Write a protein that binds this DNA or RNA. Structure first.
Lengths: 97, 83, 95, 103, 105, 93, 78, 97
DNA sequence: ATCGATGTATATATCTGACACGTGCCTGGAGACTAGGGAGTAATCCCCTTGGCGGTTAAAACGCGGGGGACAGCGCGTACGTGCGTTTAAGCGGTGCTAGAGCTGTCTACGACCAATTGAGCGGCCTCGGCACCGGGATTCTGAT
DNA sequence: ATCAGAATCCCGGTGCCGAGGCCGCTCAATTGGTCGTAGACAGCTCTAGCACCGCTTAAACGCACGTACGCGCTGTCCCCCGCGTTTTAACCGCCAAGGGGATTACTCCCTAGTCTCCAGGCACGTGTCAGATATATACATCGAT
């Protein structure tokens, strides 16, 4: 059998998902999540498909920036694995509450 | 229909792909929880604004223009859905 | 002598209303004046942007209400909206 | 005046004049200055309330920039509001991280 | 030359910029040179972005500029990246970068 | 109805810069949004400048200094040069 | 010049920020960061003053420059 | 006697967080401001309140930077802030590229 | 070390649907005129910035021990990565409905604007009380035993 | 635990100057009235958001395996800290000069508003070629033997 050592498929996926532009969060689960979030705010609201798509683009961009800063923090802590403390520190430094 | 616990619809592989696009090589198993919560905290900050726009326009449909304006207010300007 | 305007007397009235046996310094008066001007600019700009977005030419009370709801945090926005609605209804009742 | 009709302490007239001269809209509704003055008055009442609380806790009768910084940052909602604002002569909140303190 | 764009040697519309400046509640009165100046600045900025986007598309051997090429153009130019640092481009993607410590030894 | 947009103008700019290149519809939307966003930035900055100097007019000088403020160094220099060249061309004819 | 921001001054600024231990190169790095920040803020302030056709950089120009950078400063009639 | 290394540091932290005084001496900072302003426009006059505002803004920005840098150093299992800490904080906050 | 398997890139056909162009229409832009206010400009006052000098003095600078901290090396295990069969349900696609965005007609009340009036608040001046400051005592710590 | 030793908190006296209140008035806020049009509301409509159902298959998932790094420990070595002493130039007080901030009065000319005209610009239709896809192969390289 052939089995890549850990860290090879991870890097290949990193390059693959940086080269492309397609959405990474599945469309229907994110639509349902957005509707769930909006349900607590005002009932019987409808979303244009472009609005859900815009929310998805913004959320993916925000999460990719967050994971970039989290990876920077993990490298700063002499680690390779990002941990919840990494994300928490990145969010605190960025100025998020 | 009532919607409950759809936050898990953002699957562990989805969080993994988002991190890989962000350059992360190794992801702890406890990340996939925190990120989801973080993601929720993001949406509750965008949608609350967008709905606030939609409520003002005497509308019941949250348009892409409302979400774009909400993101512009939050200092996260978005290009590609009108301006 | 140029007649510069500021919110000094109003802030003093509010302070004497919320804290009778309490004073305030000129340095804190400048901070309160700057804070009032900044929040005024924020709310007015947001309501202006709402007027632009709705393609409406007037900045009414509803735009101010929604700007308050956008800029202020949940409990603070709730209290401010309640206070604003109360004041608007009181002003409208009188003539 | 209009501040008396609305029970407000900030001036309705001044806010109405600034809205007109500030070029925020072509026309300003007559209810907008009242609402905006009410919101500004409430916000400054909250700020001065917490500042006075801090000053009494600090055994002083006059509010100084330090009291304003204490009031703004100690309250989570007001800190969220004025998150990107540096208050001159305000100082910082005394907080020392856990690991820094001696064993 | 009837149009003000032809008078200023510009492709962005001076008249439209003038109307937006007037009917945009920025000032009581709008000068006659401000629309020309603002249209020129806008034209220069979009020319700056489109030059880089076309170069990036040619690097990908594509005749059509897509959001990915615009994202590359914005994020590769350091000064343009500073102008649009807090801006999300839909379908833009991210720059291909891998930190040194994550690469195998 | 009429929906105003910068599609033809961005096409013109592209054809001046890249004679044999096209733009996708989504990239057109991005460019139209970028033009509007930079327009709002410059117009708002010049509006604040006019308010700050107690000036009721938004002339070429406020726009010039708005461009000098928002845009970065080399980009600001080139944009200012372009704007003043266009203003001179307009005034001349 | 930039060396006017002395080592004990940066030490006091770090102590106010809650720093317990300071490395030796932190002083040089902080001088560089402070110079960059002042370069940006003074550039914006000087642009404002030049537009106002003034030769005196007012505190109002400084407050406007800081507000433009998303660092609004209270206490100078902003 | 002699205080153990790390006690006077905490005492100074407590003393400088309870105070509002300027931590950068006024004349050196004023000369630095004039030096920097000479690069942009020669023969410039500065209001005393303008240099005051610059000094307050610089002190606040450096205090925020040192707070974030201390958080980074503490995250890295350290107590001593280092130039890597400051660079990481600036990179996350969005100033450094 | 040579060799085998798996992933990527590619060469080319194929088919499409998104894009560039043609055409028509009409709304927003262009041009000419007027009049009105806002802005450029010269005088003037005079505030406030710049500039120099001395004194005492807090603070910056320099040197030393060392003691705590950072950094490197090393061992352990575990949990995160990778693989694989399985099940989940996302995705694509045809059809149907209707709530609600969007456009349009009206007429109305609500806002701008102008004249007169006046008092709210700004500026300047004067007073004394709160906070700045300083010395002795308690204590609350911090360090060595 | 327990000892002394500094730093700091606490408290009373002092003192000083800026905050709090009063006088003048000025200029903008209030009030009354007329005009115009922004939009609030009722109507019509028709785009699209929702809902559904079915076939397909990409993606998620849970488990087996294993091994690479997170973490804890230990050792070293060094490099900031604390403190004392010498240096220095920040700081405060005081006076001088003058540069330019700001205000006023005057005048010109630059732009808003209005009306008439007509062409750029948008909406729609349509042909077609840049690009996405499924399939077959050469090529790189990473790992087991």
């Amino acid at each position: 059998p052939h089995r890549y050592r850990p860290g090879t498929v991870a890097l290949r996926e990193i390059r693959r998902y940086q080269k492309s532009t397609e959405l990474l969060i599945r469309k229907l689960p994110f639509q349902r999540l957005v509707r769930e979030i909006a349900q607590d705010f005002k009932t019987d609201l409808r979303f244009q498909s472009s609005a859900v798509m815009a929310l998805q683009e913004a959320s993916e961009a925000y999460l990719v920036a967050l994971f970039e800063d989290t990876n920077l923090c993990a490298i700063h802590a002499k680690r390779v694995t990002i941990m919840p403390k990494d994300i928490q520190l990145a969010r605190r430094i960025r100025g998020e509450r | 229909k009532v919607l409950r616990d759809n936050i898990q619809g953002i699957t562990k592989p989805a969080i993994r792909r988002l991190a890989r696009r962000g350059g992360v090589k190794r992801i702890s198993g406890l990340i996939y929880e925190e990120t989801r919560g973080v993601l929720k905290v993001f949406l509750e900050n965008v949608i609350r604004d967008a709905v606030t726009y939609t409520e003002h326009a005497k509308r019941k449909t949250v348009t892409a223009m409302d979400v774009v304006y909400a993101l512009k207010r939050q200092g996260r300007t978005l290009y590609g859905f009108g301006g | 002598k140029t007649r510069k305007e500021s919110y000094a007397i109003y802030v003093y009235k509010v302070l004497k209303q919320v804290h009778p046996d309490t004073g305030i310094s000129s340095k804190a008066m400048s901070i309160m004046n700057s804070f009032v001007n900044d929040v005024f600019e924020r709310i007015a700009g947001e309501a202006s942007r709402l007027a632009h977005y709705n393609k409406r030419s007037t900045i009414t009370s509803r735009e101010i209400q929604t700007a308050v709801r956008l800029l202020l945090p949940g409990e603070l926005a709730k209290h401010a909206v309640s206070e604003g609605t109360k004041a608007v209804t009181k002003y409208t009742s009188a003539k | 005046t209009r501040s008396s009709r609305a029970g407000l302490q900030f001036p309705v007239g001044r806010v109405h004049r600034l809205l007109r001269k500030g070029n925020y809209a072509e026309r300003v509704g007559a209810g907008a200055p009242v609402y905006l003055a009410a919101v500004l008055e409430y916000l400054t009442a909250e700020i001065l309330e917490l500042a006075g609380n801090a000053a009494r806790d600090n055994k002083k009768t006059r509010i100084i920039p330090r009291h304003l910084q204490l009031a703004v940052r100690n309250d989570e909602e007001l800190n969220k509001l004025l998150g990107r604002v540096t208050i001159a002569q305000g100082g910082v909140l005394p907080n020392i991280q856990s690991v820094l303190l001696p064993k």
